């Protein structure tokens, strides 16, 4: 069963790239700024305290 009209491994792989591409971003930001809690997105009560 070789189908030319659609490839499905490419999509499965594309998702994993997006998964990694966000961990890279968070690490980059935390190294550039100097703090781990840069937004309320990160720890709701820690920012308040």
């Amino acid at each position: 069963a070789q189908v030319i009209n659609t490839n499905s491994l490419s999509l499965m792989t594309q998702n994993n790239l997006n998964t990694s591409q966000s961990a890279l971003n968070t690490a980059i930001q935390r190294l550039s700024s100097g703090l781990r809690i840069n937004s309320a997105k990160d720890d709701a009560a820690g920012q308040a305290i």
Partner: protein, 48 residues
């Protein structure tokens, strides 16, 4: 009166040295990581 005005206006030095060191280190790290991040998008080209 001289003593009291001194208390108002003088600058400490220990704190300033500490701040200068803190600021230098962070500037250096930022420069390195900015180079690193700019270096991120090249791998797209190989994909072609």
């Amino acid at each position: 009166l001289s003593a009291s005005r001194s208390r108002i206006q003088d600058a400490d030095y220990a704190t300033e040295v500490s701040n200068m060191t803190r600021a230098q280190i962070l500037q250096q790290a930022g420069t390195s990581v900015l180079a690193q991040a700019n270096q991120t998008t090249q791998n797209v080209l190989s994909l072609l």
